[PDB]
Design a protein around this ligand. Structure first.
Ligand SMILES: *P(=O)(O)OCC(C)(C)[C@@H](O)C(=O)NCCC(=O)NCCS
Lengths: 50, 50, 135, 72, 134
DNA sequence: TGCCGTTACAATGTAACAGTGG
DNA sequence: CCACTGTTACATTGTAACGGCA
């Protein structure tokens, strides 16, 4: 029972931590580049109008 | 002369269109993702501000 | 170096390339003996979930022919994967009839520019006519 | 149609429910769209109908009804 | 009907296509139970070198949803096979940067022409402009 | 309607050229 | 020099959508 429960706990911990690490990194990236692209686009729009 | 200038204007217009479409697509994808993570995995687990 | 090299991605690409080549029937192995080739392929198959060891399997049993094609294919795949992020960096594939393509390629080779550049110049002349018509 | 393409754009650019987006639903208070969110909403509205809007006349739009009124 | 259909060729095409799809993981057969699907796939595998029986195999075990895709794939294969004989009937494939393609497709949709026709007309106009200047 | 030609793509693989730095 | 990378111009196969025609 001890062996099984320890294996289950280790598997859960590793899976959860690695999935969060894999996903949140790219999510934050996409957010940062989205902000940057919006900032870039505003100036072009302003110049274009005049 | 005016036509020559409007050529640069159209170039800038194409650039602005490209940037705007990119930003709009990014925003739409972000909104779709947020609506797909209504399972409550986003509040802190996905949004690791660190 | 313009594109970041990611090891755990390029390794998976390489493994998939090897497996695809094998299942197509080509001799990825450098072994002429059937038994050693089969064993090496089986080990490669076992290496599915361990892309890191795939580089070593390459250095031990990869056919000497395939270095150039390998280094070409993974390079192109990297370029395409990084360009696919944004539309404005993507590429569009189109098909052209032989007479049309012949004329276009002759014109491009005349002007010493790529096909996209020649099309840009052509469409820009047409749009200049349109602009002047509009004013 | 335009009067439902507007809802399609608003819902998929703010993520709010189609039921939530009524004619009088204001973006900031009802739909919750803040500064950048409203900017992206107006940009998407521009893209959908391949038109352009003045800065002041665009910022004047702060509701679904106003959005359609300027669109139609 | 423009291209004559040859059984010993199109049947080999169909066999190769189905084997490729099976190797790709596509469910070739209509049997959800794995045993029947595997048995039918083995029948197909050992069925190589046979048009008159691969056709029957298709009629009897083929997945309903793949009929249209297989039919259009064979259509394209036939057309390409017959067109690849002569240089002038062949087709040249190129890759265009997204902005250039966007503008070209805009023009083509505007004028109702195809990409080949639109580019031909534009090149002819470019030549005409050259002659005008010259 | 269902077949049949036809177009416009997408995905991947290669050869060839041009650059870059060790 | 040499190797490794980026890029263009193809090929190859598959697919969905139109439109013609019995
Ligand atoms: P939100 O509180 O982040 O506000 C965003 C913004 C309204 C300031 C922004 O979208 C914006 O409009 N920036 C440009 C303002 C302007 O009129 N500048 C002149 C042309 S660059």
């Amino acid at each position: 029972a001890i062996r099984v429960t320890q294996s289950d706990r280790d598997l859960f911990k590793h899976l959860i931590t690695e999935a969060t690490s894999y996903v949140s990194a790219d999510y934050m990236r996409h957010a940062n580049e989205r902000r940057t692209h919006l900032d870039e686009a505003l100036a072009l729009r302003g110049e274009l109008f005049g | 002369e005016m036509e020559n200038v409007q050529k640069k204007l159209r170039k800038l217009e194409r650039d602005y269109y490209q940037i705007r479409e990119q930003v709009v697509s990014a925003k739409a994808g972000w909104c779709a993702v947020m609506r797909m993570v209504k399972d409550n995995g986003v509040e802190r687990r996905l949004h690791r501000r660190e | 170096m313009k594109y970041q090299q990611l090891e755990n991605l390029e390794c998976g690409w390489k493994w998939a390339y090897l497996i695809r080549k094998h299942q197509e029937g080509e001799p990825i192995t450098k072994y002429i003996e059937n038994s050693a080739a089969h064993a090496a392929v089986d080990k490669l198959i076992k290496l599915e979930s361990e892309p890191v060891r795939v580089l070593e399997w390459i250095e031990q049993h990869m056919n000497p022919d395939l270095f150039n094609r390998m280094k070409q294919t993974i390079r192109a795949r990297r370029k395409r994967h990084f360009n696919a992020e944004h539309q404005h960096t993507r590429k569009k594939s189109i098909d052209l009839d032989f007479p049309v393509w012949h004329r276009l390629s002759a014109l491009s080779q005349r002007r010493g520019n790529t096909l996209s550049e020649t099309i840009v110049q052509l469409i820009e002349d047409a749009e200049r006519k349109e602009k002047y018509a509009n004013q | 149609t335009i009067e439902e393409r507007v809802k399609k754009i608003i819902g998929e650019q703010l993520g709010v429910k189609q039921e939530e987006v009524t004619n009088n639903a204001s973006f900031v208070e009802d739909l919750g769209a803040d500064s950048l969110d409203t900017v992206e909403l107006v940009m998407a509205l521009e893209e959908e109908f391949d038109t352009e809007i003045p800065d002041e006349e665009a910022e004047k739009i702060t509701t679904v009804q106003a959005a359609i009124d300027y669109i139609n």
